[PDB]
């Protein structure tokens, strides 16, 4: 996302506004305003690792844009909107992740490698891999009888189509010591 | 759902795995090792587009 | 299927470690264990 000092009405603010978000969702409701449309209206830009060096990024727009003129104790401890140099804003930080990691529920509440382990295991799980399984003659294929979409889900799953083509089933689980088996 | 982006060869579905390399026509300076006659080098891996 | 079409192989001074530059461009968790760890990146 592009952030410009350029704002007659106040401070340094994100080129993209609430009016654009609604204009996109007009086209989302049909299934005029595409992604290319945001690119050519210059509200968003493509940055390689070289150009990354010369820019300054905001994580959250809202939290990292207006400044302070009480606090919830349960939430994780975040920094500040200190910078007035911000050239760019991050669309969503959860986009640092690739396909497999994006199926991990709360990976931020997990130990660093436990996530790397999951992003290797989900490639050994079962379930519907394609709806055409019956019309194709593959050397080995496993399909789960009754796939269930997860109860705990990532907003990123919407795009991976995981709710449509699952890997598991929501099991009723008890973390207990029983017969010692 | 099937995304494409793959090939069908002699029956099987083939994926061309992205092969990472260092960029060409790039000027780089490196401190060459403690026991060496050369202290620093300016390398340029230059090849036509 | 998706994660296999977003794979990246690195042949052959310390490449296996997660570099600061990889932020936003590569997955910090999706990587194999063992001999390929960090040389097999996922976008």
């Amino acid at each position: 996302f592009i952030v410009e000092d350029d704002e007659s009405l106040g401070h340094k603010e994100l080129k993209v506004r609430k009016g654009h978000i609604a204009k996109l969702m007009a086209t989302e409701y049909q299934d005029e305003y595409t992604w290319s449309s945001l690119l050519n209206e210059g509200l968003v830009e493509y940055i390689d690792a070289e150009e990354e060096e010369s820019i300054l990024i905001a994580m959250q727009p809202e939290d990292l844009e207006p400044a302070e003129a009480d606090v919830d104790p349960a939430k994780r401890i975040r920094v500040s909107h200190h910078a007035t140099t911000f050239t760019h804003c991050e669309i969503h930080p959860s986009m640092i992740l690739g396909v497999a990691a994006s199926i991990i529920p709360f990976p931020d509440h997990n130990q660093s490698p436990r996530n790397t382990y999951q992003s290797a295991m989900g490639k050994q799980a079962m379930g519907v891999f394609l709806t055409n399984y019956n019309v194709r003659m593959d050397t080995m294929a496993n399909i789960l009888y009754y796939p269930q979409k997860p109860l705990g889900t990532t907003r990123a799953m919407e795009y991976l189509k995981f709710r449509e083509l699952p890997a598991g089933q929501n099991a009723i689980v008890a973390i207990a010591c029983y017969s010692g088996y | 759902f099937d995304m494409g982006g793959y090939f069908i060869i002699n029956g099987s579905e083939k994926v061309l795995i992205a092969q990472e390399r260092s960029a060409g026509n790039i000027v780089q300076v490196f401190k060459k090792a403690a026991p060496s006659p050369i202290s620093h080098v300016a390398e340029i891996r230059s090849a036509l587009e | 299927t998706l994660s296999h079409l977003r794979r990246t192989n690195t042949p052959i001074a310390k490449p296996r470690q997660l570099h600061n530059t990889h932020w936003g461009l590569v997955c910090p968790a999706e990587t194999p264990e063992g001999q390929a760890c960090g040389l097999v990146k996922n976008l």
């Binding site: 994100l14 996109l24 305003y33 595409t34 | 061309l16 | -």
Partner: peptide, 30 residues
Amino acid sequence: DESAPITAEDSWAVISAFFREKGLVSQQLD
């Protein structure tokens, strides 16, 4: 107010429109 600043959930409406045009294997194809 069609120029009111964007919220947190609003970023998903852009991400949605991204894949909508691009798609998850764009790179291999393009």
